[PDB]
Design a protein around this nucleic acid. Structure first.
Ligand SMILES: Nc1nc2c(ncn2[C@@H]2O[C@H](COP(=O)(O)OP(=O)(O)OP(=O)(O)O)[C@@H](O)[C@H]2O)c(=O)[nH]1
Ligand SMILES: [Mg+2]
Ligand SMILES: [Mg+2]
Lengths: 63, 97, 125, 285, 65
RNA sequence: GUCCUAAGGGGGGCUCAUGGAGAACAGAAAUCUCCAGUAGAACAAAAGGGUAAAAGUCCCCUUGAUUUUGAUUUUCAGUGUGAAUACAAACCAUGAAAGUGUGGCCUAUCGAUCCUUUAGUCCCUCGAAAUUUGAGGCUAGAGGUGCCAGAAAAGUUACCACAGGGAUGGCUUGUGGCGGCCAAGCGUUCAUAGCGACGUCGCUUUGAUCCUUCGAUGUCGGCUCUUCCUAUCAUACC
RNA sequence: AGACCCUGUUGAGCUUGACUCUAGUUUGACAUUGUGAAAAGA
RNA sequence: AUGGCCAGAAAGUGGUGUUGACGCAAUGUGAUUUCUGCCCAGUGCUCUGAAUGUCAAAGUGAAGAAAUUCAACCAAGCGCGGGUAAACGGCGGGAGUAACUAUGACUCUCUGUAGCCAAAUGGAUUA
RNA sequence: GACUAAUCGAACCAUCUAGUAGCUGGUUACCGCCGAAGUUUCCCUCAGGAUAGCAGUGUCGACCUUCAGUUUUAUGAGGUAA
């Protein structure tokens, strides 16, 4: 929300999640949304493609 | 706000850029650069040309004494008169406000 | 009430009569929203009965424009100039610079960075 | 405004965010004594660059009607007026009149003491260069009254008169003339206007020793009739416009020393006390 | 300059996107528009930041930003 | 109906309308000379004190017709290297200089065979007759989108259906681009300009670093099996 | 004579402050609706 | 129950209903375990709370010889002004004040190699 | 969007009905005399129009006047070679 306020001039901000396999990027996105919006599995490489999830009006999350 | 400014604010009409509103254009047929308006502008193209094509019906409907060489100046005078009436209306409205 | 018709909505919202409208305007759709959603529906050319394109699609105009540059005095002047005092102030500022993790960069200032940043080490040079 | 010159004059007389230096109009009534004319000449000499002078007789009583003053402000674009008068009740009067929007903002009368008035030419010293703004010193207890009065308005008009042109920098050689106005609370108090030249002398210290020498003119006034501004006009005159180069401070937005725009993010205190760890099988004895 | 980028899982595909086929300059502090609202596509492999500039008088070629 | 290297800006020089006296045509009124001429002329505004070695009028220079930068002001931006805008700075023009000055002004659109409105008393008709209101026809006028009315009939079908129409090439290969120089030669030799192979010169780590992989609209395969080309990896010879 | 693409004065199904309607609902008036009193007035 | 939900062209018409809130009807979610990011009040939900501001039909008053015209009056809904399922939705915090109520506005600064606490467990890594 | 007699995003039967199509397919003996054309001009375009021009049958008028995608003469443009 603070980053969105700092970029209030733009229409929205994109927040992309990076890291090692099986660290919990899709789990973090699902937790922030409060709903299972991204696929989650304990095996590495469950997420294979980039995915947009609209968290709020001006916050997008990129898995 | 004038009538145009209010209408543009309602319709989302964006102001033209300074590069877009320049009094300069490239004429392909002559291969030269010329002005759109003003002295020797594109709005008065052919008033000094040696030969002008004239339609027979247009010449028949043309009043006596007038020629084809002043039609563009007539149209400019009409447009200037309309723009002047509109800006006088805007100034009167702003004076009442 | 007044009525759920579009004209009744226009008089209820008090828009100045005689104004043009974009096709598809309603209570849920403004002109900007209709343009945004019609962008997604763009991309189809207009064709005749034989499939020949009579009107090209958006940004596929196929006509060659006259790519010419006008003579202008602005092309031969310096667009950006900087003074020695300003350069010295920027050098002192960059020497004074300290990194803070809780600050973010929102807009970079267009500066002649090669004349401001310090030189490399003499061993490397 | 058909011509470019008339357009330039209209744009100069147009209202602006930062204003032009105010112009002072020096004019006299039908009766004006020689002492009053000499005082007007001295004030014009103090303010040559931003003043205009009338030379005819004007049958105007400023406290009865000021329509002609408003007309003169309209025509000459003058925001200060020094009006000279002479009468049996008031022998030598200088009426300081300040405009706002080509209408009279406020007015104040000064009565001259004739036996003590000294012109600039009667002092045999070096004089001020043309265009140099003199510094100002206001002394006494009459200027800090809690209620706005005639002395406070006289101070405001004298500041606006000897203000000159604003400047963010000044040469150290342009600190050589001072104008001192002295007035005390109390039978009528006397406002004394003096001008001095400044000499600097070595004192064995980095700060120089300032010595004064009288420059002229020597004026003694008694404050007279008083026209206070309208309240709404006073707030409209005391509205302060904002320069476009003066930025508005945005929350958590700043500019660093290199001109980069910097945002501030705030994390907050890390409170992990209420986090319950996972109760694994290996963590149980 | 622009080529149609077709999107959709049907046989009939939406064609509103365009891609610039010539090198582009995007400038500093560039963040790409999101894919739902990105009509014009300027690929990263075609973005240039420096150029070999020749001075006609000095007869010197320098790579400049 | 014509004419203009446009307006504007800067600098320099001169003084105007008018009156008197004079000069072949020239005679109230042509042109020229002197004297007197606070502007009584011209240029702008609407002074109750605008301008006289000028703000008037002629010469010289620019005419580049709307410059660049900005983390700043206001507004806007599904095309966010931001755009318009205000302000500031730089640039520019002129001048010996002090300085001066510019880097725009505006506006929704549509009808004129249209809309609104007025008059006809001695105009005609209301069909059984007359009068008074009213309505229609015809004629003559006035104004011009502030007070001349009005200008709001959307999508989707991957659930589908019908009537039809369709499904560059004797190209390519092994050697970069831009800019300058040299250059045998081609030309030229009342102009000494212009092309130019062969080349060359500038931009694109002391055997390193490995902590900079830079976007599917375009789609390939696998099996079995036959043949062809050489631009030959191997075997053969040099 | 499948599928796919393109065209139509295209047909049909579905949706929505698209247009005109309408079932239903709500509100007002009139008739069904008669008989007396007690006051306030014109 | 002089009720709701329906059906019927209508009906002295039918169903729920041989029914009566532990019921009937309509929704969303979908065992158990877990579970309700923080705060409101813009859209919407509902308040007979004052108004006639919009205000049809019928009715009332005036002008004319009438056709006709003009005026008040004018229900519901809308509008205005209040509380919310606070559902949708918007909302980076925390302090002050000069505003004084909505909207404020103007400054300041903000980053245990296995524990504690909760009625054995701390789970959704659910048999 | 499944089923409702092999028929279902609206069953079957008969009628209005020979519904409509600008789209598709087809359109039946012989010989003779002529015989074509693609911005010429105007209109808001595509899902557009007329219109000029070129043609065939009849006639009529004194089928009277004659005219002509040609040259020459003279004068223009091209004064351009020479
Ligand atoms: N205990 C515990 N487990 C977690 C947490 N976050 C994620 N996990 C587990 O870690 C696993 C891997 O994370 P993912 O959801 O697959 O996300 P990821 O890191 O992007 O993995 P990939 O999609 O394969 O790249 C998940 O199955 C979760 O069960 C956590 O905070 N605590
Ligand atoms: Mg995983
Ligand atoms: Mg993942």
């Amino acid at each position: 929300r603070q980053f969105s306020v700092l970029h209030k001039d733009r229409k929205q901000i994109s927040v992309g999640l990076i890291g090692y396999p099986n660290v919990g990027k899709s789990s973090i996105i699902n937790a922030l949304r409060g709903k299972a919006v991204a696929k989650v599995a304990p095996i590495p490489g469950e997420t294979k493609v980039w995915q947009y999830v609209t968290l709020m009006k001006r916050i997008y999350l990129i898995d | 706000e004038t009538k145009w400014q209010a209408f543009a604010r309602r319709r989302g009409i964006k102001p033209k850029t300074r590069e877009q509103r320049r009094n300069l254009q490239y004429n392909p047929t002559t291969g030269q650069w010329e002005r759109k308006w003003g002295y020797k502008g594109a709005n008065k193209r052919g008033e000094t040309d040696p030969i002008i094509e004239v339609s027979a019906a247009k010449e028949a409907m043309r009043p006596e004494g007038t020629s084809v060489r002043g039609d563009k100046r007539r149209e400019i005078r009409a447009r200037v008169k309309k723009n002047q009436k509109q800006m006088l209306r805007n100034q009167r409205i702003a004076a009442e406000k | 009430g007044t009525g759920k018709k579009e004209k009744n909505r226009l008089l209820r919202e008090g828009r100045t009569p005689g104004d043009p409208h974009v096709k598809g305007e309603n209570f849920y759709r403004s002109a900007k929203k209709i343009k945004t959603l019609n962008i997604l529906k763009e991309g189809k050319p207009i064709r005749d009965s034989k499939g020949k394109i009579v009107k090209a699609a958006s940004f596929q105009s196929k006509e060659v424009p006259k790519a010419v540059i006008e003579p202008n005095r602005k092309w031969f002047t310096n667009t950006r100039v900087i003074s020695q005092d300003t350069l010295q102030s920027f050098r002192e500022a960059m020497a004074e610079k300290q990194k803070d993790p809780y600050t973010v960069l929102l807009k970079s200032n267009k500066l002649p960075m090669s004349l401001i940043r310090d030189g490399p080490k003499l061993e490397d040079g | 405004p058909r011509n470019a010159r008339s357009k330039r004059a209209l744009e100069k007389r147009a209202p602006k965010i930062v204003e032009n230096p105010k112009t002072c109009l020096f004019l006299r009534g039908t009766t004006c004594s020689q002492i009053t004319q000499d005082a007007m000449n001295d004030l014009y000499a103090m303010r040559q660059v931003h003043a205009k002078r009338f030379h005819k007789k004007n049958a105007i009583h400023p406290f009865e009607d000021a329509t002609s003053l408003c007309f003169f402000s309209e025509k000459n674009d003058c925001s200060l007026m020094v009006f000279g008068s002479s009468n049996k009740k008031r022998p030598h009067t200088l009426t300081f009149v300040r405009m706002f929007d080509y209408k009279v903002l406020d007015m104040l009368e000064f009565y001259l003491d004739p036996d003590t008035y000294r012109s600039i030419s009667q002092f045999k010293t070096s004089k001020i260069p043309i265009g140099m703004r003199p510094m100002m010193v206001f002394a006494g207890t009459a200027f800090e009254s809690p209620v706005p009065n005639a002395f406070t308005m006289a101070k405001s008009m004298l500041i606006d008169f000897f203000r000159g042109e604003p400047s963010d920098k000044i040469d150290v050689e342009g600190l050589r003339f001072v104008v001192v106005v002295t007035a005390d609370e109390p039978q009528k108090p006397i406002l004394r206007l003096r001008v001095y030249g400044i000499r600097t002398k070595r004192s064995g210290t980095r700060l120089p020793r300032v010595e004064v020498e009288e420059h002229g003119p020597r004026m003694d006034f008694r404050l007279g009739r008083m026209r206070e501004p309208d309240p709404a006009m006073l707030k409209e005159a005391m509205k302060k416009a904002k320069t476009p180069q003066e930025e508005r401070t945005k929350k958590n937005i700043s500019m660093d020393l290199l001109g980069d725009k910097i945002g501030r993010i705030h994390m907050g205190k890390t409170d992990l006390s209420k986090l319950q760890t996972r109760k694994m099988k290996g963590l149980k004895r | 300059m622009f080529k149609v980028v077709k999107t959709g899982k049907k046989t009939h595909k939406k064609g509103w996107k365009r891609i610039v086929t010539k090198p582009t300059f995007v400038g500093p502090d560039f963040t790409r528009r999101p894919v739902k609202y990105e009509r014009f596509i300027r690929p990263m492999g075609l973005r240039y930041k420096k150029a070999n500039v020749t001075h006609p008088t000095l007869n010197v070629t320098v790579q400049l930003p």
